[PDB]
């Protein structure tokens, strides 16, 4: 998160911090996720892609931090990693950016509800918020374009939603703008998503509902000018999401 204000996972306690297992005791950050119920992680299949086995990976529920433990946080093995078959990318714009994760700790267990660990609403199909509309994001990414470093502490920012004829136009991102993709951005370009916030929230308020409305996806750059975030339009995929959640 480029911009924003540091956060605790009790401001977002449906984000899931997944993280990748290596030949060598390098456990490493991979993506941002959102529980959306008790044994579901929704995140973005290009996190997955590169290395598309369950058993490369570890979802943390409860988790503020990057590189240490929260108190109360859940730690769980991935029991199934179902990808987008139609996922797609180019240089930039990755279609259909969508991943479920199906998790389950050494225990056997799915996640337990607490005040660090909750669900997240899913958006009523193609029931999307105005242009304008103010909505947050959340995750571990750089707050640089030129840092090297994630941060160690949880971040948000607020973001406004563009319309797909604003997004389409040539200056921003033409023909790699879809209507299954959601762009969002600050007035003044000063706050975004960056590198390593992909696979989490995007959450809007919809008629009183936290809602997930987006899962972070891609971008040119981080808080660019006429550069966008861009997010998958999770209401467009509930089929897709009901189907793989059984």
């Known amino acids: 998160i480029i911009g924003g204000e540091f956060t605790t996972i009790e401001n977002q306690p449906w984000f899931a911090a997944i993280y990748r297992r290596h030949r060598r005791g390098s456990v490493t950050y991979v993506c941002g996720g959102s529980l959306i119920s008790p044994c579901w992680v929704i995140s973005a299949t290009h996190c997955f892609i590169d290395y598309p086995k369950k058993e490369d990976y570890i979802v943390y529920l409860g988790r503020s931090r990057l590189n240490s433990n929260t108190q109360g946080e859940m730690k769980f093995e991935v029991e199934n990693l179902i990808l987008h078959k139609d996922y797609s990318a180019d240089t930039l714009a990755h279609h259909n950016d969508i991943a479920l994760l199906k998790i389950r700790s050494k225990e056997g267990r799915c996640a337990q509800p607490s005040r660090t660990i909750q669900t997240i609403a899913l958006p009523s199909m193609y029931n999307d918020p105005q242009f304008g509309t103010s909505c947050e994001i959340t995750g571990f990414g750089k707050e640089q374009s030129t840092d090297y470093l994630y941060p160690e502490q949880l971040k948000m920012t607020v973001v406004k939603l563009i319309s797909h004829r604003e997004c389409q136009q040539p200056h921003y991102y033409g023909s790699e703008v879809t209507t299954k993709m959601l762009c969002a951005a600050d007035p003044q370009w000063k706050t975004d998503s960056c590198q390593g916030d992909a696979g989490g929230p995007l959450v809007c308020s919809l008629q009183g ?38």
């Open 209 to 246: 509902r936290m809602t997930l409305t987006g899962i972070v996806s891609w971008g040119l750059g981080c808080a660019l000018k006429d550069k966008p975030g861009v997010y998958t339009r999770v209401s467009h995929f509930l089929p897709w999401i009901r189907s793989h959640t059984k």
